[PDB]
């Protein structure tokens, strides 16, 4: 069922992806690299005192604070959902090998008994209504770009000036490029305007992953993570093998002279992709206005900020179902890309823009280095983009693609299993739009709060409530998938966008509260994804610009966890045992240094201004801007702080671009 073409780096098709500059050439050739991360300034993730600390703390906390999750996956009591062994990784050292990304997910979906298109006309109307509501009366805004982000294929530039020039040129030439693609001239569109080529595969660390302590043996067991070899990836699983990657860290002693304590493992590695910036810029210019619409008009379903903001919605429900989606991005259906494109064309969107959008979701992928002596291969032919990878992480609208799929998937689940009496309200496009508009505003007896693959489904009092309880029971049983679209189950320890839903004895949403996840505090403080990058002079370009600032927002973020104080005291005690120093004093010093450094970056901040005008969100984002890519949005951050992390193309250039894309 068609193997994807593959080209080695030596091939002209792969050579054309990398411009004639040092950075692009280094990116093409970059071999497998590993090493301890600089967790904090002057501290390596593999420092013997740090690993001794992690061993003592993970063991103590698991012992004293066992998980309090009921038969229905509801968190109660201590607010703990698993053991604390997830911190036991040699950060910066990955599992070997990392996966080869699947060129086609069609067989994967078919074998999982998932649909190859909308099942019924109702579902087809609902997916199409989502497009009409999301993409209709949009307002132009400046195109914001993350500082220090790469332009990837073909230039691999990290320079803001160059990135602004590339983006402005892309908005000027997107029409000409899209029209070339409509003529099947993909090579011309790429050669002339750098729109096409491929996604560049970067493997990112998932710093904490499941580890269990076997009581029988007293030995730790790391969660097996299945990886596809090259053959499996190019054949969509028809040939080759899917096997467990090796998380064994013993190798670090032999290879690097690093002492590996018992029960410490190599990190899980996830595929991440970087899009060709010239293709992403015209997509982002439409994606940002879409987010502004859904986060304003449909704020109920889509705009999530604080634990109390979430709580106010959930408390009004009679039933709250916390769902889980298995491997969202890899299962994301190409038929949805095609349905979205078809509907945008029906709405009157510029065909050239729709073509650029369609192409961004069929693009080839350049595999860097999954393991030593592996990679440097282009999957798919850039002359005719035809891949079915699912959802590419670096596509300009990935969040919206996952949100569109999932919001409708959950609504369909509620209709099928709980609310057949609402089917008569979805007869045609106008009625599908009116119903969805009402549902997304939280005006129906069936409700939801969602973001991509994370959601909480609600039922108020009414006819659907009884069905709601049967659906929850079906999820608990776990024998039948409630959706024809994706693999849905209930979350083991219900949470929404980082906040755990803490139930009491009643196990009802009315008396349940949202609390910060204490395990996430530990993940962020002791297992960061990236090092401090102390050699990157411009802090705003770092993955962790101001790590010290997270101490100032900690109480606001995690203070509501039942065991907050217990954890901080356990940290203090264990850090004293390991370093002979006060962790609290160490973090207070880092907080002071980073507060002072911050004023250099904020125009409104005087030489020693302090954090007085900054919110807890501002502080969490300055310590971890990745939270701005999965948890929060631009509007949640103070304007003077957003400017530290992002730069924009003028609204004058985007306004002119948007006028040419949009209907009448
Ligand atoms: Mg899952
Ligand atoms: Mg969740």
Which residue's entry shows tokens 């040419």? 660
Sorted by sequence, the CB contacts under 8 Å of residue 265 that are 6+ apart come out as 88, 89, 90, 95, 211, 220, 222, 247, 248, 249
CA distances from 351 to 96, 174, 181, 197, 497 (A): 44, 11, 10, 20, 36
Answer yes or no: do 161 and 178 share one domain.
yes
Answer yes or no: do 211 and 346 share one domain.
yes
- Judged by its nearest atom, the ligand closest to the C-alpha of residue 451 is 2
Instruction: State the Cα–Cα distance between residues 126 and 167, nearest whole angstrom.
Output: 34
Please tell me the distance between residue 450's alpha carbon and the centre of ligand 2 in angstroms.
9
| Binding-site residues from annotation for Mg(2+) | 453, 490, 494
* Cβ(171)–Cβ(143) below 8 Å: yes
3-state secondary structure of 47: coil
Please tell me the distance between residue 47's alpha carbon and the centre of ligand 2 in angstroms.
34
Please tell me the distance between residue 647's alpha carbon and the centre of ligand 1 in angstroms.
35
* Cβ(544)–Cβ(624) below 8 Å: yes
Instruction: State the Cα–Cα distance between residues 485 and 465, nearest whole angstrom.
Output: 23
Listed residue (424, 454, 460, 455) closest to 442, CA to CA: 460
- Judged by its nearest atom, the ligand closest to the C-alpha of residue 491 is 2
Sorted by sequence, the CB contacts under 8 Å of residue 255 that are 6+ apart come out as none
Q: What angle do CA 339, 329, 547 make, to 5 degrees?
A: 130
* Cβ(368)–Cβ(448) below 8 Å: no
Answer yes or no: do 78 and 153 share one domain.
no
- Judged by its nearest atom, the ligand closest to the C-alpha of residue 75 is 2
* Cβ(245)–Cβ(95) below 8 Å: yes
Please tell me the distance between residue 324's alpha carbon and the centre of ligand 1 in angstroms.
6
Please tell me the distance between residue 393's alpha carbon and the centre of ligand 2 in angstroms.
19
| Domain assignment of residue 97, yes or no | no
Please tell me the distance between residue 528's alpha carbon and the centre of ligand 2 in angstroms.
21
**DSSP code string of 317-379:** -SEEEEEEESSHHHH--HHHHHHHHHHHHHHT--HHHHHHHHHHTT--EEE--SSTT---EEE
- Can you give the CATH number for the domain in which 600 is found? 1.10.490.60
Answer yes or no: do 382 and 343 share one domain.
yes
Last residue in a domain, options 485, 517, 549: 517
| Binding-site residues from annotation | 453, 490, 494
| Domain assignment of residue 96, yes or no | no
DSSP 527: S
Q: Which residues surround ligand 2, an ion (CB under 5 A)?
A: 454, 491, 495
- Method of determination is X-ray
- Judged by its nearest atom, the ligand closest to the C-alpha of residue 406 is 2
Answer yes or no: do 414 and 269 share one domain.
no
Listed residue (562, 527, 532) closest to 545, CA to CA: 532
- Judged by its nearest atom, the ligand closest to the C-alpha of residue 323 is 2
Please tell me the distance between residue 481's alpha carbon and the centre of ligand 2 in angstroms.
18
Last residue in a domain, options 479, 494, 517: 517
Instruction: State the Cα–Cα distance between residues 596 and 404, nearest whole angstrom.
Output: 42
* Cβ(17)–Cβ(198) below 8 Å: yes
| Domain assignment of residue 547, yes or no | yes
CA distances from 174 to 277, 476, 660 (A): 12, 49, 10
Please tell me the distance between residue 328's alpha carbon and the centre of ligand 1 in angstroms.
8
Please tell me the distance between residue 603's alpha carbon and the centre of ligand 1 in angstroms.
44
Please tell me the distance between residue 324's alpha carbon and the centre of ligand 2 in angstroms.
6
Instruction: State the Cα–Cα distance between residues 205 and 91, nearest whole angstrom.
Output: 8
- Can you give the CATH number for the domain in which 653 is found? 6.20.410.10
Please tell me the distance between residue 488's alpha carbon and the centre of ligand 1 in angstroms.
8
Please tell me the distance between residue 240's alpha carbon and the centre of ligand 2 in angstroms.
33
Please state the domain count of the chain: 4
Please tell me the distance between residue 327's alpha carbon and the centre of ligand 1 in angstroms.
6
Answer yes or no: do 223 and 353 share one domain.
yes
- Judged by its nearest atom, the ligand closest to the C-alpha of residue 453 is 2
Instruction: State the Cα–Cα distance between residues 322 and 335, nearest whole angstrom.
Output: 27
**DSSP code string of 260-318:** --TT-EEEEEEEEEE--HHHHHHHHHHHHHHHHHHHHTTHHHH---SHHHHHHHHTT-S
**Residue 343 backbone phi and psi in degrees, to 5:** -70, -40
Answer yes or no: do 78 and 198 share one domain.
no
Please tell me the distance between residue 479's alpha carbon and the centre of ligand 1 in angstroms.
15
- Judged by its nearest atom, the ligand closest to the C-alpha of residue 328 is 1
Please tell me the distance between residue 68's alpha carbon and the centre of ligand 1 in angstroms.
20
Last residue in a domain, options 474, 499, 517: 517
CA distances from 589 to 282, 297, 551 (A): 44, 43, 10
Answer yes or no: do 406 and 348 share one domain.
no
- Residue span of the structural domain in which 284 resides: 277-332+398-517
- Can you give the CATH number for the domain in which 499 is found? 3.30.70.1600
- Judged by its nearest atom, the ligand closest to the C-alpha of residue 320 is 2
């Amino acid at each position: 069922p068609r193997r994807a073409p593959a080209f080695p780096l030596s091939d002209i098709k792969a050579q054309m992806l990398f411009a004639n500059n040092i950075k692009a050439q280094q990116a093409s050739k970059r071999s497998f690299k590993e090493g301890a991360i600089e967790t904090y300034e002057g501290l390596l993730s593999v420092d013997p005192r740090f690993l001794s600390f992690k061993n003592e703390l993970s063991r103590y906390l698991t012992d004293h604070f066992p998980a309090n999750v009921d038969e229905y996956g509801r968190v109660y009591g201590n607010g703990v959902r698993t053991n604390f062994f997830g911190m036991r990784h040699m950060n910066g050292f990955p599992m070997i090998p990392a996966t080869w990304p699947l060129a086609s997910n069609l067989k994967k979906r078919a074998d999982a008994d998932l649909a190859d298109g909308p099942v019924s006309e109702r579902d087809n109307l609902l997916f199409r209504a989502a497009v009409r509501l999301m993409f209709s009366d949009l307002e132009p805004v400046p195109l914001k770009i993350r500082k220090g982000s790469s332009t990837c294929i073909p230039y691999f530039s990290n320079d803001m000036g160059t990135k602004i020039e590339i983006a402005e040129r892309a908005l000027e030439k997107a029409e000409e490029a899209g029209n070339l693609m409509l003529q099947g001239k993909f090579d011309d569109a790429y050669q002339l305007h750098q729109m096409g080529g491929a996604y560049y595969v970067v493997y990112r660390a998932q710093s904490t992953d499941a580890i269990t302590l076997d009581p029988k043996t007293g030995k730790f067991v790391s969660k097996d993570r299945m990886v596809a070899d090259f053959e499996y990836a190019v054949t969509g699983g028809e040939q080759g093998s899917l096997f467990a990657a090796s998380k064994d860290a013993s190798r670090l002693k032999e290879q690097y002279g690093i002492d590996v304590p018992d029960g410490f493992f190599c990190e899980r590695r996830r595929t991440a992709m970087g899009g060709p910036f010239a293709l992403n810029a015209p997509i982002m210019a439409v994606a940002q206005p879409v987010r502004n619409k859904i986060y304003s008009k449909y704020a109920y379903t889509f705009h999530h900020t604080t634990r109390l903001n979430k709580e106010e919605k959930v408390k009004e429900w009679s039933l709250c179902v916390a769902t889980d989606v298995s491997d969202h991005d890899t299962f994301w259906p190409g038929w949805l890309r095609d349905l979205i494109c078809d509907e945008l064309l029906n709405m009157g969107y510029a065909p050239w823009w729709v073509k650029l959008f369609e192409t961004s979701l069929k693009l080839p992928v350049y595999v860097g280095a999954p393991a030593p002596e592996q990679g440097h291969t282009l999957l798919g032919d850039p002359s005719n983009p035809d891949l079915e990878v699912g959802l590419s992480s670096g596509q300009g609208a990935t969040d919206l693609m996952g949100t569109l799929l999932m919001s409708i998937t959950y609504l369909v689940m509620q209709l099928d299993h709980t609310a057949p009496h609402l089917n008569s309200r979805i007869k045609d496009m106008p009625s599908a739009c009116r119903f969805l508009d009402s549902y997304w505003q939280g005006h129906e007896e069936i409700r939801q709060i969602s973001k991509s693959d994370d959601a909480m489904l609600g039922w108020t009092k009414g006819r659907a409530l009884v069905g709601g309880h049967r659906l929850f029971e079906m999820l608990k049983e776990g024998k039948v998938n409630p959706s024809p679209y994706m693999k849905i189950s209930y979350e083991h320890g219900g949470a929404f966008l980082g906040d755990i839903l803490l139930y009491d004895s009643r196990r009802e949403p009315g008396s349940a509260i949202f609390v910060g996840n204490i395990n996430s505090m530990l993940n962020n403080q002791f297992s960061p994804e990236y090092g401090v990058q102390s050699g990157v002079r411009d802090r705003s370009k770092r993955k962790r610009p101001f790590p010290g600032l997270a101490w100032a927002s900690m109480k606001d973020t995690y203070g509501a966890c039942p065991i907050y104080s217990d954890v901080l005291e356990a940290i203090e005690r264990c850090w004293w045992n390991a370093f002979g120093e006060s962790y609290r004093a160490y973090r207070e010093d880092m907080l002071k240094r980073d507060t002072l450094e911050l004023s250099r970056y904020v125009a409104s901040m005087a030489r020693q201004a302090g954090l007085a005008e900054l919110t807890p969100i501002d502080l969490e984002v300055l310590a971890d801007p990745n939270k701005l890519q999965y948890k929060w949005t631009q509007a949640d951050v103070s304007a003077n702080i957003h400017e530290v992390l992002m730069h924009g193309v003028s609204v004058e250039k985007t306004e002119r671009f948007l006028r040419s894309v949009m209907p009448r």
